[PDB]
């Protein structure tokens, strides 16, 4: 944890002339404002203010004044800004005029579930995300095209894979920002890319994801490309998800890892798996929040389709990578990169604690390709399906109690409400598909 | 009813040189073959044959030989063919190599329900359809555009309404074919048109609808236009439905019309209304068979949204026009022009007979604008909603028993099966809407 | 600079229909020499009665100074409801629908933010206007109507007439006439500036009154 004179010393020592205070609305979009260094004890005295009317999911126009309280632990400088315009950043939580934190701030809300988990004996909730993304070419006037940067596949090399330097450039700015980058490569789909980085505290992991996406889209544009984290932007090729590798620690204890078992898993980790499977239908709407999200949750693309766990398996909802030890984890593959990381985490966490709190029994693993399983054959072993559309996700959300717990009223309410207009709007448009499949035949 | 020497005399007297035998597959598409007059006792001896493998909804490639049995009552000549190439037409039912009628022929299937209704005391099942349609401009190479012929509205005149002569031309060919045309006008939406004609026997009414559409699309093309019966081809304007005005007759008895009641309805007509409301969810999938069909079953466009009846009302599922007397009818507004007329009729008929057979009690009428009714306020008076998507229509179909009765196994089965692939295919594509609403924001 | 970036900056009140207009909010205060004469540290509100008298001031005369603070025909396509621009004469704290908003900041930051002004206004005239409107409320010590602490856009005519909320002038012409009866504004600009602003803008209006929009041709030229 950093001091207030910690960051006072930092702005002198590096001559940081501008400060970007950041936070996150309900859809997971970074929102921020730049302030000259001149203003640094307004920001440090927490007297920074903004307008909640114009933030989706926050507040009404008559209740609109809101405050930013910076979190000094988040401090970081941008390795490409420098000189007369060197820029530094602080992520903030949102406070009301009360002086009290805002019930509707996704991030403070994660901090809230994390106390419900340190009350059950655990030090940290560690997350390692796998945010995949596509790269599209830009046109003369700087706007995206439907033309992917390459037509390469998994682990391909240049010139089959042309995102090489862009990913390199992304990595070095990320590296020069504090990330421990783990790997960088081309994923399965044409123009699809992956850059993995090391796990971190529940809150700082999401802080990481929201910075990750900021850097991907900014460098991508400099390379004359458009980066999208849209779950499934083209039909018939792999979508891109955000796999959430997750683990509880008892202070350098990997509490999921039993060191003499042959499969190497404690069963407080077994019970965790039980709760996320019990509540999977419940939280899908926050881990798959677009209508586009469900066009990626169809079989055949290494995306979770049915609710089940297995090891060394990319067909199921929950993989347990072969890696054990301090790296023993469960990878939750449903989440896609459009999900609000802070909220997706609170849902998965509380879903896993109501799995231990309730001492729940794990189901048996499906060590098969689930996509090759007959509907009746999978109904035989009793495996549920995930919601097939955002509407069905929504209604499964208002049935599940564990999710309202994880999100609270203001967020739970402002979410069902907003994602139901996006469904209404979408269930009125006429797709090129119908017109293309119906207007001449009928 | 006509004789075989009836039509022998007809081909001599007019010198009809070509014969078009017609029938209908499961999606309501006219299928036919032209035969020289040379072949007229092959056709009359029922020795005409074709291939059921290549007809959707019929039969397998190993069971493929099928026969046509013409229905001589249907005879009609085309008032635009003449001379060396004068053409005449006979609608046929499909028979197997058995000699027995094909279980899967929508039309013979209507004839089958009609015997289940003359066994309950009624002479005819009379239908008057209102098939609405749009007119799109063609381009240089003869292919449709998204440009409507006019930007007129209801009952408009030229030059605001430019479909005048086309509709005229349609009417005179229709008139010269035996239709008693009733009215012709521009309906609510831009480039939308209506041409009503007088009611007829259950079977000949559908025979009429399938000819209607044939003539609309043929004249429309000569006028350099493209006619579509797509339910909802553009968002934000009125779709076009096929209102089914329906009545039972006891031989010139309008059995729906009570002549001293003030509202003028017998209650064998009241019980009929009860059964179509009891089974509405069941048969929607056949009266609204496209995914496009449900983009028209959204509130605000004079299309049925919730299951309810009223009089003088275009907001509800079932209208009872002010017209009483020999014209007392219930108009069933859900049906849209993409529905197979023969099948839509069997569903609505059997739905209404299980309403009298079961002596069912009518509900109370909603004499209001149902679209202005709060969701909870309409849940208060207990009015169901129609299926919001073709998938929900399908599953409501496999629950309802009255519909499997109306369609039989081969048709019921071949329908759930085929319209579920069209849903699968459609619930995999990525709409310009998502890419347009998601690819830059995420 | 915007040009040096191949861009074009405009302070036009609402260059585009259907999205927020750009307004030039005037947060103002009165000082008695290093101390914010708007801020009472004892009371819970945070406001002295000079701040109350002062806003009673601008509220009372808002109709009169509106033409000067919203001086283009375009100005009045921003005073449409629903875009965080005001269109009713009212005041609230913490609230962005009303004419005057008073921010949560107190201490040396206590102030009234007059949301009416748009960036097309002549700052020295608008400020001269608001200052004397306030100065009127201070030397007649008017007492302030009670605040309107809801979204003032979602209120019906019946619901606003009840509480006594006057609209601001809908058009520039109507704003000019509001300007000719309000006498406090005439002393604010002086005879010379008052007259020539009125002239200049009266004839600006006449030119707009006679234009034919292609709004109109896109509606009436095929319909009628
Ligand atoms: N104990 C752990 N808890 C949480 N995350 C972990 C743990 N061990 C490793 N990880 C995370 O797993 C991720 C590895 O992802 P990746 O290498 O793409 O896996 P794979 O390719 O097998 O799916 C890293 O992001 C890292 O943070
Ligand atoms: N007794 C009846 N039974 C069945 N159909 C009828 C009866 N009387 C009239 N019709 C039909 O009603 C239709 C009238 O449709 P239309 O004039 O467009 O009605 P509206 O415009 O009021 O909806 C005709 O197609 C006609 O066949
Ligand atoms: C080869 S893949 O395994 C495919 C990811 C998939 N497109 C998804 O939607 O999660 N994922 P990874 O190697 O990143 O764990
Ligand atoms: C004015 S309308 O009443 C509108 C028909 C609507 N578009 C529908 O989908 O049925 N129908 P009609 O006058 O043909 O009975
Ligand atoms: C949310 S807004 O509050 C919008 C004001 C708008 N531009 C207008 O005055 O039309 N402005 P700000 O928070 O900068 O005061
Ligand atoms: Mg808002
Ligand atoms: Mg650098
Ligand atoms: Mg990986
Ligand atoms: Mg993974
Ligand atoms: Mg076939
Ligand atoms: Mg002719
Ligand atoms: Mg009509
Ligand atoms: Mg009708
Ligand atoms: Mg402001």
Numbering used by the authors:
A (entry chain E), B (entry chain E): 5 to 446
C (entry chain A): 223 to 446
Text lifted from the article:
To visualize the active, transition state (TS) conformations of the GS proteins we reacted them with l-methionine-S-sulfoximine (MSO) in the presence of ATP and solved the structures. In these structures, the Met-Sox-P methyl group occupies the ammonium substrate binding site, thus mimicking the GS transition state and preventing further reaction. Structures of the Pp, Lm, and Sa GS-Met-Sox-P-ADP complexes were obtained to 1.98, 3.50, and 2.95 Å resolution, respectively. These structures were all dodecameric and densities for Met-Sox-P and ADP were clearly observed in each enzyme. The GS TS structures all display the same contacts to the Met-Sox-P and ADP. Strikingly, while the TS structures are similar to each other, they show significant differences, both global and local, when compared to the corresponding apo and FBI-GS-GlnR bound states (as apo and FBI-GS-GlnR conformations are the same, the state will be referred to as apo/FBI-GS-GlnR). The largest local structural changes between the GS TS and apo GS/FBI-GS-GlnR-bound states are within the active site loop regions (rmsd of apo GS/FBI-GS-GlnR versus Met-Sox-bound GS subunits is 2.0–2.5 Å for 400 corresponding Cα atoms), but the rmsds are 0.8 Å when the active site loops are not included. Moreover, superimposition of the TS dodecamer onto the apo GS or FBI-GS-GlnR bound oligomers (comparing Cα atoms of the dodecamers) results in rmsds of >3.0 Å, indicating that the catalytically induced structural changes are transmitted between subunits, causing significant alterations in the oligomeric structure. In the TS state, Asp62´ and Arg316 are repositioned to provide an optimal active site architecture. Thus, our structural analyses indicate that GS enzymes from low G + C Gram-positive bacteria adopt two distinct states, the active, TS conformation (herein termed the “A” state) and the conformation adopted by apo GS/FBI-GS-GlnR, termed the “I” or inhibited state.
In Gram-positive bacteria, nitrogen homeostasis is controlled by an operon encoding glutamine synthetase (GS), a dodecameric machine that assimilates ammonium into glutamine, and the GlnR repressor. GlnR detects nitrogen excess indirectly by binding glutamine-feedback-inhibited-GS (FBI-GS), which activates its transcription-repression function. GS generates glutamine from glutamate, ATP, and ammonium by a mechanism that involves the initial phosphorylation of the γ-carboxyl group of glutamate by ATP and the subsequent incorporation of ammonium. The structures show FBI-GS binds the GlnR C-terminal domain within its active-site cavity, juxtaposing two GlnR monomers to form a DNA-binding-competent GlnR dimer.
